Design a protein around this ligand. Structure first.
Ligand SMILES: CC(=O)N1CCCC2(CCCCCC2)C1
Length: 460
């Protein structure tokens, strides 16, 4: 039975509006409704992994698990195994997988983050799950961010608190937040970004939705505009939205948007918005292709419609050689030439690099770089030809070309990371000097760049 080099992943996000679901929710898991939908010819083909994020979920874990498993069994005649379930207040994540994957999945982690302070601490935040699938690390975040059209900055702050403090993946990756710990990271939920148009335009917006003319609405979507201004979700992808706004509906129909201010809304308008979203970030040059992104039309218990997204995702096998794991493979090496970090910092400390990768026995610390002044004010940290030669555990190119090197640039004075990034070993050539590049972030914000050349030696 061969190990897969691709899997498909279903991501669902649904704000249930504190109401039990209807008796049938299969359209959700089938990616049927509006938007980029799944072909009918695939209906019986199970996804490998289903990740379900709910918000305002009134069910017990037991009650929801029974609905989800019975739904998937009806669709596929497969009894899915529960990988993980984690709930913070009414925010929940469930991971289910085909039984054949049970001994491919390990290192399962769960965590939550509570956002806000005092007033604003008590119902918003995120839950997450991570695990290894053979040689590939997968992370999943379900977040319910701050509501209200005039709170986009709060949502952006909630995002930064979640990526800083959610403790998933390999704890040995200590300089790295969740935006660098996984081969594939999926972040979804009721992100609560709104269509920023005047209140007086509510009926105009509704008209546009009825005509399936989303362009003038998406150009005011706060998540798209904040992402384009690099205020949030830097280096994450989202599929094009081709489904109607998923909020705020009258319950028990989808024929009506309920947008007017009411005591129940705190006297706030809820103009039709794409609150419910799926985004992802994968390591460079790993296969990830969105195969559906849309909303259901037939699940009407909530004032939100469920959202689905499906992905093909590249995976790798748990590689064993005669040599590594448990030793190095002298036929392998990674060299770095003409490397320099450009940092936005106003500080003057010495810096060194750390290289982290599961292709190394442990992380590698460089010598200090040489600081110069850039022509436009910047700090340039020159490593020249001074970086160590990295010694991978396995030299086989079928393994090594699929790996990645995480880079942290740290202050010698404080040992705090000023920037993190990632370099793919999926090179055009081996034994050849080739350009490399990564942006550097810290707390998910741009802090600089790392560039230079790489020379990769494999056993071939
Ligand atoms: C690959 C990627 O994610 N990019 C590059 C192209 C522009 C951006 C995507 C379009 C939506 C708004 C954010 C800007 C970001």
């Amino acid at each position: 039975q061969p190990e897969p080099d691709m899997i498909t992943i279903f991501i669902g996000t649904w704000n249930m509006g504190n109401a039990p679901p209807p008796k049938k929710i299969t359209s959700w898991f089938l990616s049927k409704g509006q938007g980029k939908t799944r072909d009918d010819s695939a209906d019986y083909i199970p996804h490998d992994i289903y990740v379900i994020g709910t918000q305002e979920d009134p069910l017990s874990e037991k009650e929801w698990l029974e609905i989800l498993k019975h739904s998937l069994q009806e669709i596929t005649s497969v009894t899915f195994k529960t990988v993980a379930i984690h709930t913070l207040w009414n925010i929940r994540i469930v991971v289910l997988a085909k039984p054949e994957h049970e001994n491919r999945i390990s290192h399962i982690c769960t965590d939550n983050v509570k956002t806000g302070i005092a007033n604003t601490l008590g119902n918003k935040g995120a839950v997450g799950v991570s695990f290894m699938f053979n040689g590939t690390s997968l992370g999943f975040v379900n977040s319910h961010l701050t509501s209200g059209s005039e709170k986009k900055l709060r949502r952006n702050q909630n995002y930064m608190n979640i990526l800083r403090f959610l403790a998933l993946g390999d704890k040995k990756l200590s300089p790295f937040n969740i935006t660098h710990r996984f081969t594939h990271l999926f972040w979804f939920g009721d992100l609560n970004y709104r269509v920023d148009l005047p209140t007086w335009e509510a009926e105009t917006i509704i008209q546009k939705i009825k005509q399936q003319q989303y362009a003038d609405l998406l150009s005011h979507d706060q998540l798209l505009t904040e992402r384009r201004e690099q205020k949030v979700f830097l280096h994450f992808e989202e599929e094009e939205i081709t489904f109607a706004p998923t909020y705020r509906f009258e319950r028990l129909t989808r024929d009506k948007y309920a947008y007017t201010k009411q005591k129940a809304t705190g006297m706030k308008y809820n103009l039709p918005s794409w609150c419910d979203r799926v985004l992802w970030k994968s390591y460079p040059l790993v296969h990830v292709v969105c195969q559906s992104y849309g909303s259901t039309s037939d699940i009407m218990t909530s004032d939100h419609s469920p959202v689905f997204a499906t992905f093909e995702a590249g995976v790798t096998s748990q590689f064993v050689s005669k040599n590594g794991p448990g030793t190095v493979d002298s036929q392998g090496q990674i060299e770095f030439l003409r490397c320099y970090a450009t940092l936005k910092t106003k500080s003057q400390t010495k810096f060194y690099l750390e290289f982290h990768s599961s292709c190394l026995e442990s992380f590698v610390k460089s010598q200090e770089g040489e600081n110069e002044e850039g022509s436009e004010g910047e700090l340039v940290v020159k490593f020249g030809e001074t970086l160590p030669k990295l010694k991978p555990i396995i030299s086989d190119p079928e393994y090594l070309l699929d790996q990645h090197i995480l880079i942290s640039i740290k202050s010698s004075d404080s040992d705090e990371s000023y920037g993190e990034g990632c370099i793919a070993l999926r090179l055009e050539a081996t034994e050849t000097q080739l350009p490399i590049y990564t942006p550097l972030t810290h707390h998910g914000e741009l802090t600089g760049h790392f560039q230079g050349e790489i020379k990769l030696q494999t056993s071939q």
